[PDB]
Symmetry: D3
Amino acid sequence: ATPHNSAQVGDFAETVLMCGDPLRAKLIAETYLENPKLVNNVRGIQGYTGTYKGKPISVMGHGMGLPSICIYAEELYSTYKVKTIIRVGTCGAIDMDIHTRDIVIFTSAGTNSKINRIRFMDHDYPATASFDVVCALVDAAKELNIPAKVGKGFSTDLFYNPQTELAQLMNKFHFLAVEMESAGLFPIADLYGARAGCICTVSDHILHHEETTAEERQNSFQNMMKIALEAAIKLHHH
Amino acid sequence: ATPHNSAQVGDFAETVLMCGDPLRAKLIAETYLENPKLVNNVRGIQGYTGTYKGKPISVMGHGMGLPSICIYAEELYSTYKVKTIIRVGTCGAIDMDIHTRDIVIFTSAGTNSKINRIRFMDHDYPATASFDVVCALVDAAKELNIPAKVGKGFSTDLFYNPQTELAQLMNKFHFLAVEMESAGLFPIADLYGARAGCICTVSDHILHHEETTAEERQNSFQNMMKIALEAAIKLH
Amino acid sequence: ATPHNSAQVGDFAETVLMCGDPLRAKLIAETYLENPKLVNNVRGIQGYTGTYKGKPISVMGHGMGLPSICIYAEELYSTYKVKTIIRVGTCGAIDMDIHTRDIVIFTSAGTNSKINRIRFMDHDYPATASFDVVCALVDAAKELNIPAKVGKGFSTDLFYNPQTELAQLMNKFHFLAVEMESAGLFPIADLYGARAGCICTVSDHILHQNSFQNMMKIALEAAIKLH
Amino acid sequence: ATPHNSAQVGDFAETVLMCGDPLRAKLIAETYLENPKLVNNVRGIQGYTGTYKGKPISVMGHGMGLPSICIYAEELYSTYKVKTIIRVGTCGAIDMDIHTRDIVIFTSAGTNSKINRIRFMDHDYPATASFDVVCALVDAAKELNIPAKVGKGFSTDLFYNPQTELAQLMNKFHFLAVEMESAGLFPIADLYGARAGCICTVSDHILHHAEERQNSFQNMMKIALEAAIKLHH
Amino acid sequence: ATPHNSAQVGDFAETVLMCGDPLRAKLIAETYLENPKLVNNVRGIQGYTGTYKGKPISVMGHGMGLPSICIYAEELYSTYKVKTIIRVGTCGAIDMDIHTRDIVIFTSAGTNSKINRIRFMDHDYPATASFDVVCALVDAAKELNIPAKVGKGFSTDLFYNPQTELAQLMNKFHFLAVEMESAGLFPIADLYGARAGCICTVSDHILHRQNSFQNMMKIALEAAIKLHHHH
Amino acid sequence: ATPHNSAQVGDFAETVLMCGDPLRAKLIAETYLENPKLVNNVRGIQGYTGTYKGKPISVMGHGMGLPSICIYAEELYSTYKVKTIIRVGTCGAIDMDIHTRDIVIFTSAGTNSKINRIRFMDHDYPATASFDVVCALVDAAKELNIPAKVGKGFSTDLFYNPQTELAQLMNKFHFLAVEMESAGLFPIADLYGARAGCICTVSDHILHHERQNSFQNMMKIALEAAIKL
Ligand SMILES: Nc1ncnc2c(CN3C[C@H](CO)[C@@H](O)C3)c[nH]c12
Ligand SMILES: Nc1ncnc2c(CN3C[C@H](CO)[C@@H](O)C3)c[nH]c12
Ligand SMILES: Nc1ncnc2c(CN3C[C@H](CO)[C@@H](O)C3)c[nH]c12
Ligand SMILES: Nc1ncnc2c(CN3C[C@H](CO)[C@@H](O)C3)c[nH]c12
Ligand SMILES: Nc1ncnc2c(CN3C[C@H](CO)[C@@H](O)C3)c[nH]c12
Ligand SMILES: Nc1ncnc2c(CN3C[C@H](CO)[C@@H](O)C3)c[nH]c12
């Protein structure tokens, strides 16, 4: 029904977990959902709908980077009447106390893209996560006794950033981590009167080269997924 | 000890409430604080320190506009070793459902100022309220049975905005209200690894003319004031 | 009559002197104006109207910063029918040559604010002092034998400037001094077909009564000249 | 050996065709190459290496949008020593005489992204296709007798573009077609001394209104593949 | 000695009048200067040096546009050690009451060019005429009884302006007239601790060579005499 | 017919060669054109129209910098119904391999001007030479066995560039040369559904600091290209 989505109105739960890597979405469905149906596989994006603790949930990839999340998120919010998108991703740490495997929940997301300036008369849009979503995520992590840090992210357009000075600027202002998606997501939810959040697990540090193995990874990705899901259950009221 | 402040390190409590109107800072001090002391009156700014329910609090004006609050906020965080500034202000409603006398708590603030671009290599800084402060403010509002709305603010450099289409664009995106300070406060607190938040009472609507003829005013200021004072305690 | 001004049309004279410190404002009124009256104290801003050598003059605070002066200037030119604003302030010297207590007349003011670009389709607006005013101020100083430099100012949004290299660059281009207001004032005066100028006394160097009175005398004399 | 790419140096050929759709990637490998090995499937991206009419060729997805292609392309030119990339995607037509099924070769691409201004001191970078590639793409289209239009493209950050007056502005300036990638790619080619180009098939008109596709996309593919052969020598 | 100027240090006077039409520079030389000599004609730019009432003066073309004038102004002030440049051009009128062949003296110049942003860390540089020069032009006009308006100009990069709304905006803020040079000129003078100004005869109205041109030239030349005396 | 051009419609050929120096326009018309008539000398601009190998070709100065060429170019495409403009100029080399008296043909040109952002909703316009024209100039140079380099140029607003680090930046991206005109030219051509191109002779080097015989090579190529059109 869209160029990027073969599903119809109703095929998506009104809460969707989203991540960059479509194989992670497949994994989330195969691992945590009851009765998962493939609802969208246009461009291999792996969108599934099922339940978690009896409540309807959906999981899908959004591809890497703001332009990509901006396509999917808009479609979900407008065509498929989705109410909440929680991005579950990875990130690169900025703060010196945050390490690999750590978990981060974003209040907001800076960016170097021009997308919001196009949306917002060339002024400063504050890409902000839904207050609710943050709470839900913070409480889920507490209840699950998993430590989670709370603060600003940065959505870069350039994984390989030629501005080498930028990391330390972000560390001066106590940014927590870098990903490529959240600043595209937050204003879009605002635009549709809907809600959005972002929770991330740290995959590498950008201010030193760390130790990440070839599998773990998974163990901390698992916690993030668990928090996301419990939080998703709290949102649903109403 | 600064060009804008005749107090010495220690003269301010570690938590400070600020507002545009220095006469408002006077009122807060003369009304709510116990044993208040004038600690700074350079340029008639009205800086006071006392305690609230026995807890050290300070209050001071911050002028109108990002430049002004940027001077005072930085000085306070820097020289005076302040950990938390809550801005207690007024604002112009954007959202059709927020009405005069309603109380707004900001999660963050957008802006048309250039200050954060200057601070941040020409990129997009999200001026964000400190999560702890938003919580405290929301909790205190609940506790006191005062309805309070949570969301985005816009800090304008231009009260009389020659961009007439912008009011509606802000409304398209569900901005709650407009003031002139928060977008400059929030990053400064980050800089010093301190905390900041903004609570506001609605004094006008920028999308029609509404309830200016009302006497809250003080009954709505008072509510905001008490939410702010109570939140301040809860951050100590 | 405005959210920033309890006064009525006519409560202000056609000429207003403005400064950042409202405590300075009241001192000015008291020190120079016959029968001065408080005409606005919304936000402790201290606006007074009286006369000077028989001629009507107002004085009021404008707060620090472009957004603040923009509020007050527009209202005075708009609602209050003010014809001429002269900012009588302080400034941070830039030029290697300029010294603490020196008097500076701005011909224009550059800026790092975005306000002018928002007013002017994102192009470079030259915030220029009214030429008539610069004349009145320079002649005044000549007749009074007060030395006064004439040139560019820079209105900054960031008193504590994270751009540490900007001071040398302003020196390189012979900017005379830094304040935080003029660049906002001048474009507004043009907008209303009115006049504006700024005169400063140096208080500090960003690189390396006496003057206060001289500045006041200069401004007040110039105000007579522009009738 | 990169976080987006499990392959080692040499696993990719010197010439790499790229598209947005990693399923279209897979399909090209299966359809056009002999003995296609899968060399990278990190994030489902479908990187294949085989040969076509003898010479070595690779094919991989690049996701949608500048930030995505910038990741892959840099990695390809940098780690995997790739010499030539030809993007073989789709596009939204702008010009009034460009229709669905029609095939466009881009000389350059403009953009509303800020990427290039970040690379190029906040000035204007002309994201230009490599002169070789464009010739080759055109030469091939003549040889294979395929009608192909040459000119400017536009790479957008914003598929659902809130600036609705931009489409006509691009018509005014005779921009052929919109996609989301070339503006990112080309400057990177430049940066590593390498070469890039773009051929696209029209999937929609942005100024008005499943099987060709397998005719015009079929045609596009032949032009690209034949051009690749001319370039690897 | 420069890529755009065959002359050597000393060949130009400390005061130089510049216009954009090189054919005009030749006429000015003939019409006003005693013993004018060709000093530079790289690119047909018609550079001349003579005296006017016994005080040394030069006149050169500067071509149209900010990039051109920036080249010529920087060379004069650095290589040729010029102290004062006065642009004596034409301009299209903006203000409703400024009419064809009126005389405008610019206090400053707005611009749609990025040049001053590039020079000044992407902030607002106010391309301001040197106060002395402005004063010398004003006084001269009063001395000669020539009415002359005073206020801001705008230097465009786009003679044919695709931003059709821009003229009316400029009118809103009381810009007097448009040219294509002064915004380049002013900041360069400042860079070299020198002086610049611009005087303009209105040739057209964007909203709605012996008389006005003669008058502009006298004011520019009489002002050139006042400057030089201090210093 | 215009503030800068005295000629009427018909006076210019469909193809015009344009340079910065009017003394070169003059020297080109005298040398390569048969029966050159001076069609426009407003502001000393030196506009001629003749024939070459039996075909109408004009030649005119365009001044220095984008603002100037943007006036002339838009008048020629607009009032004079010109179809093709080939700029034949000088340029300072950027790439460490390119040298004095080399001949660069521009595919496209970057700029530090604001002119294209004004024209283009504050986005990035690729000032691209017309593909036909680049072919023609490339083909013509084979024929005459003259080495021609092909790629990106850069039009600066500032000959004396206070951005001292820019030169290397351009080298890091293998920009061949800097001039001051092509970035203005190309989008006007597009705007008028017309064609433009640009070819230069290298007069200086901006990173590691005749005329004639390289200028002849340049002139021959451009004229030869003009024929193929
Ligand atoms: N170093 C670094 N930079 C930017 N982003 C990330 C991320 C987060 N996501 C990974 C994907 C790109 O590798 C993109 O979706 C953001 C992990 N480490 C990162
Ligand atoms: N309409 C409108 N615009 C900008 N700001 C405000 C405010 C908040 N503050 C009041 C002061 C200006 O009136 C300034 O401190 C912002 C209330 N209504 C406003
Ligand atoms: N160093 C420095 N920077 C910016 N401005 C000033 C001023 C002028 N006014 C003083 C107020 C702040 O100290 C501000 O309104 C401008 C004096 N020294 C200054
Ligand atoms: N209308 C429109 N806009 C932007 N791009 C395209 C494309 C080309 N690609 C398809 C993907 C978006 O659907 C993106 O990778 C570019 C076809 N039609 C498009
Ligand atoms: N309408 C209009 N626009 C921009 N500039 C001018 C000028 C001033 N000079 C004329 C030259 C262009 O014709 C240029 O050098 C500036 C006169 N009328 C003008
Ligand atoms: N170093 C350098 N910078 C900018 N441009 C050029 C040119 C090319 N043209 C010569 C004229 C400036 O001297 C201008 O038309 C561009 C040769 N060398 C140049």
